[model samples]
Target: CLRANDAPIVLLHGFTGWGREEMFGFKYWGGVRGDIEQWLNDNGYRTYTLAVGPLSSNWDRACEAYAQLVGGTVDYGAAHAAKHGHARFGRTYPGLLPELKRGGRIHIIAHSQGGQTARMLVSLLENGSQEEREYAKAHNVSLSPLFEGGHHFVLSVTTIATPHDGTTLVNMVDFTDRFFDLQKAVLEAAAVASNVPYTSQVYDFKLDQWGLRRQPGESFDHYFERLKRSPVWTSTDTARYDLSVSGAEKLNQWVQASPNTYYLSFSTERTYRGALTGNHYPELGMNAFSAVVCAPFLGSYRNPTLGIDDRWLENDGIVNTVSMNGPKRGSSDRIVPYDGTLKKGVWNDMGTYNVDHLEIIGVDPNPSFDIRAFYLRLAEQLCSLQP
Candidate 1:
């Protein structure tokens, strides 16, 4: 009976995330609780976990995802590539669900930056890129259908612990000054500390467009230096900028909510209110590495420059809870609490959950909450949506 809306569910990973094959078969959707994709597929739901560039900007990530979905080389748009000084095209995928064009759309459940990527993909698909179209027409060159617009290829988008309005965590750190250092630190720490080691051999940076890919047999130290001195940081076409408050706002202007697609957002909070300071404190269960700075910085952070206040203090160790609802600061999209009715275009706020950023995706070290059950329920609800 639910077959009418049997649109396949696509899982998009967030910043510094990996493909199923990467990290030695470690699944990004569910770290230690086993692969969520395998579980969902066993339960009769067609699911796929996609690997877009983990460090690329939303524009680049969306373009790569489009190719993965429909099968083609990724065209980063002529104007965009020229402006950013990167290759116009990237790797090609044979199409995960090419049949999605034949009357079936996809249900995208993206986590972290993947949420922004999903929104960008929908925007490009439905509205196309005027700049890209003009460039193609002017050059009399063949254009990818992704930039053609007027296509309803997405049925719904569900963002989990996403920073829709932008996170103040970016504000706490001066992104422009320390973007590359922070990225290197995170990667190095994950390699040695996390359950799954982010070995460079297995984990791909996917920055071939900028010619920043690690050379075979190259020492990690040399590669690190190359990345540190690369021009990718100067360009806004990177995860470092897109995850920032200013960068996210710029993106919100371009990727607006669509009236034809259902939008749902799930925000998480692992910080508790401080009794004396009136600030939020990170729970002990939060990731040790992130807790060191994330909660401490964001819990009491105030930015007069951006008009950020206490309302933005509460976070899930990564994204501020308030920013996870929907696009509000820079866009005209509506965000309404979910009242059992799934409205299209407007964001149906799924309320806040008591989990950290990692736990929400089943990477909890203690492992108390039933992350598997949580996703199963969500997949069931998504399957029940009317086509």
Candidate 2:
């Protein structure tokens, strides 16, 4: 008998996220409320939260996810490595599901940038990189099976508040702006949250590909300086680019929806329009951090370069609501409203909810919202799907 519960569920976090153990036991999947992964496991579901490079490019993060899933060293592909001027190989991991390649499958639940990473992994698994193959042949080096492609190990993919069409938020913030040292600024903010000084031992950046790692006895200031000098910030091979309007469009150009896996997307909206200005404003109950970023910036931001305007104003504080419905701006994928019946191959746009990006992942400012029961219902639905 085919059943949805047969496959394990993997949770992938978004930008600047920490692992299950990081953040002083505060989980990335669940904020001040509680641990979502543990709660799901206790309820008879085999759920695992995966921690990928929070700021790494989709290609690199996807490669790492593949290695962690089936057990092996990560290969970023020979051609890709040479172009980016970084090491081709990265950390190895004991398989989370060693049997995945042997006709086994798992479901993926990803948020924000992690959603793009999930899609990239599936695409690479299906269509092996020809450039890598050629490079391996000429250089007389063995290529990883991941680059060989033709594997379908993902049963389903579910994304919440993902920027499938990319967001204008990246442009509004302007990483390249002279005054804003994006890498440094974000890191400092993260450090402020910790009681002690920031250390790689406590929080891993997973930047092995760029040869960026903290050394023993190294001061935080020196390590941070090294990070600031890294060439990654200047290159398009980082998250800052991938989450931008142009970057996601380029990503959707090649990375496609898999016909073998069921696709679902949920949009989050915590912003409403005002009567006078006709501009969107963050809900009163929205997270304070998000409200600050959304109310004055994302809510009023517009970009004529990409033909973006007020239509893209409705956001979940982090991503525009329109971009969360699945890949559409650049790719030719079908998106249909999800009904009671199950469907495969097309994206089941589950529609929008009155929650911000963080709220959807259990960090609800509105205490009345039942994030736990919401996930339980989702898990039940997933478990009911036919294998």
- The clash count for each model shown is 0, 0
Report lDDT (Cα) of residue 18, candidate 1.
74
Q: For residues 39-118, what per-residue lDDT tens digits would candidate 2 score against the true structure?
A: 77898778988888877899999999999999989989888999988889998889899899798888898988889999
Cα error, residue 38 of model 1, in Å, equals 1.1
| Residue 292 in model 2: lDDT | 66
lDDT of candidates 1 onward, in order = 0.81, 0.79
295-368: candidate 1 lDDT, tens digit per residue: 78878888889877888989998888888999877888999999987888899998899888877887655467
Summing lDDT over every window of 10 consecutive residues in candidate 2, give the lowest-scoring window.
178-187
